[PDB]
Design an enzyme around this catalytic site. Sequence first.
Site, PDB file in Angstrom:
ATOM      1  N   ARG A  45     -40.711 -10.617 -15.024  1.00  0.00           N
ATOM      2  CA  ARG A  45     -39.878  -9.944 -16.006  1.00  0.00           C
ATOM      3  C   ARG A  45     -38.684 -10.830 -16.325  1.00  0.00           C
ATOM      4  NH1 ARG A  45     -35.302  -6.004 -15.377  1.00  0.00           N
ATOM      5  NH2 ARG A  45     -35.447  -4.382 -16.976  1.00  0.00           N
ATOM      6  N   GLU A 136     -32.501  -0.069 -20.331  1.00  0.00           N
ATOM      7  CA  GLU A 136     -31.823   1.157 -19.834  1.00  0.00           C
ATOM      8  C   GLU A 136     -31.007   1.921 -20.908  1.00  0.00           C
ATOM      9  OE1 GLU A 136     -29.567   0.003 -16.407  1.00  0.00           O
ATOM     10  OE2 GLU A 136     -31.379   0.368 -15.155  1.00  0.00           O
ATOM     11  N   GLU A 246     -37.481  -1.820 -12.395  1.00  0.00           N
ATOM     12  CA  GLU A 246     -36.362  -2.332 -11.608  1.00  0.00           C
ATOM     13  C   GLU A 246     -36.287  -1.483 -10.366  1.00  0.00           C
ATOM     14  OE1 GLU A 246     -32.474  -2.687 -13.435  1.00  0.00           O
ATOM     15  OE2 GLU A 246     -33.214  -3.518 -15.287  1.00  0.00           O
TER      16      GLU A 246
HETATM   17  O1  LIG Z   1     -24.890  -9.104 -11.131  1.00  0.00           O
HETATM   18  C1  LIG Z   1     -25.033  -7.696 -11.140  1.00  0.00           C
HETATM   19  C2  LIG Z   1     -25.133  -7.244 -12.593  1.00  0.00           C
HETATM   20  O2  LIG Z   1     -25.973  -6.095 -12.576  1.00  0.00           O
HETATM   21  C3  LIG Z   1     -26.347  -5.602 -13.858  1.00  0.00           C
HETATM   22  O3  LIG Z   1     -27.215  -4.434 -13.757  1.00  0.00           O
HETATM   23  C4  LIG Z   1     -28.479  -4.578 -13.139  1.00  0.00           C
HETATM   24  C5  LIG Z   1     -29.613  -4.347 -14.118  1.00  0.00           C
HETATM   25  O4  LIG Z   1     -29.520  -5.229 -15.237  1.00  0.00           O
HETATM   26  C6  LIG Z   1     -29.554  -2.944 -14.683  1.00  0.00           C
HETATM   27  O5  LIG Z   1     -30.636  -2.832 -15.638  1.00  0.00           O
HETATM   28  C7  LIG Z   1     -29.497  -1.902 -13.544  1.00  0.00           C
HETATM   29  O6  LIG Z   1     -28.990  -0.606 -13.932  1.00  0.00           O
HETATM   30  O7  LIG Z   1     -28.557  -2.265 -12.548  1.00  0.00           O
HETATM   31  C8  LIG Z   1     -28.603  -3.581 -12.007  1.00  0.00           C
HETATM   32  C9  LIG Z   1     -27.493  -3.714 -10.942  1.00  0.00           C
HETATM   33  O8  LIG Z   1     -27.847  -2.949  -9.765  1.00  0.00           O
HETATM   34  C10 LIG Z   1     -25.052  -5.193 -14.592  1.00  0.00           C
HETATM   35  O9  LIG Z   1     -25.457  -4.725 -15.902  1.00  0.00           O
HETATM   36  C11 LIG Z   1     -23.944  -6.267 -14.616  1.00  0.00           C
HETATM   37  O10 LIG Z   1     -22.710  -5.713 -15.090  1.00  0.00           O
HETATM   38  C12 LIG Z   1     -23.764  -6.954 -13.251  1.00  0.00           C
HETATM   39  O11 LIG Z   1     -22.980  -6.104 -12.381  1.00  0.00           O
END
Ligand SMILES: OC[C@H]1O[C@@H](O[C@@H]2[C@H](O)[C@@H](O)[C@H](O)O[C@@H]2CO)[C@H](O)[C@@H](O)[C@H]1O
EC number: 3.2.1.89
Length: 334
Positions: A45, A136, A246
């Site tokens: 992915r 999301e 995820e």
């Molecule tokens: O480096 C951390 C990064 O996490 C991102 O979120 C990820 C992922 O992309 C989402 O789809 C999911 O809800 O959560 C994970 C983290 O557990 C986030 O969007 C960023 O702001 C960073 O914090």
Amino acid sequence: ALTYRGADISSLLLLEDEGYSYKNLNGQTQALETILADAGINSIRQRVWVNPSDGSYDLDYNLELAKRVKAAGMSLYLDLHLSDTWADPSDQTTPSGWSTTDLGTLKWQLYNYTLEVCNTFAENDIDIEIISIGNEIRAGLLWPLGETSSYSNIGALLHSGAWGVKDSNLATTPKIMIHLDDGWSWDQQNYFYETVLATGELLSTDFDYFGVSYYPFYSASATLASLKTSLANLQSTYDKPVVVVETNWPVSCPNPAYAFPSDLSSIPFSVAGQQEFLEKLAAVVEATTDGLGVYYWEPAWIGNAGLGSSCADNLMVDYTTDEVYESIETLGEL
Ligand SMILES: OC[C@H]1O[C@@H](O[C@@H]2[C@H](O)[C@@H](O)[C@H](O)O[C@@H]2CO)[C@H](O)[C@@H](O)[C@H]1O
Ligand SMILES: *[C@@H]1O[C@H](CO)[C@@H](O[C@@H]2O[C@H](CO)[C@@H](O[C@@H]3O[C@H](CO)[C@@H](O)[C@H](O)[C@@H]3O)[C@H](O)[C@H]2NC(C)=O)[C@H](O)[C@H]1NC(C)=O
Ligand SMILES: [Ca+2]
Ligand SMILES: [Ca+2]
Ligand SMILES: [Ca+2]
Ligand SMILES: [Ca+2]
């Protein structure tokens, strides 16, 4: 086995740039995608950003990474963030250059984007298995126009994005996914789709697969039981296959900010813990009519072990040696 046993390793090329390298289960240095492929991981992915300043996760980045995924024998799932940076339920920043004021114009930009992302991939001769129109998007996408004050707008933007995919020159048409967080909550899941489909701007035939996130450390309500129901109800109600796109499980989590759910509180924070978790999750998904798979989020992200959670290490690699843990094999045999 599940049809799809995957990992999101978007960070890979950035991490190789900084110097880093990975060791296989036998201690020998090897490219991460071949290591994973060898573990039974059949699908990768990748997150796509539109015009990030520094070119992280852009189209060019993704072609470079996808060539390697293709070479390694694995299928490709593009996760269109539809933004210049992280997209999630509290940040859905419309790409710079795209409209924050005219829906007619944003829809065209989105159609053009998905069409031409796809056409470039077809031009470079790379097949796409799954494409998500947003990451999301339970709180919508492309803010402000696609905020949840307008499910009509969200529905219409999804229809545009989907239609760019269908109209592209890809030899085989990618399966089109709509991806929501909080996979465990049937009321959240169902609320989005009934409300959006009710508008008549998204048609049921515009898309192919449900995606859900499923994380254990952001709410004590994320029970395997609640997920079993959400997944079964999505499938019975709307007649489409479901994928968990995820998930994480910590190998170290001394200061969780939330209680873990009741049916997961007996699972240790270890490598063996990760395997038990992935096995228990996979069983739920194997038993869901038309449950196609599980993708782990960022198993190899050296220097970001917490992966955004209140847990200290959610990686499936030892960041002191850069060696993958045995948990990778359990992922590949799910
Ligand atoms: O480096 C951390 C990064 O996490 C991102 O979120 C990820 C992922 O992309 C989402 O789809 C999911 O809800 O959560 C994970 C983290 O557990 C986030 O969007 C960023 O702001 C960073 O914090
Ligand atoms: C519609 O979407 C595309 C995709 O992001 C926007 O970017 C443009 O994409 C096209 C098609 O890939 C690029 O053109 C191609 O470039 C290569 C290499 O230079 C060439 O071999 C091809 O024959 C073709 O010319 C284009 O350069 C790129 N533009 C930018 C500014 O990055 C496109 O702009 C979107 N359209 C609109 C009107 O907003
Ligand atoms: Ca490079
Ligand atoms: Ca072995
Ligand atoms: Ca093997
Ligand atoms: Ca809001």
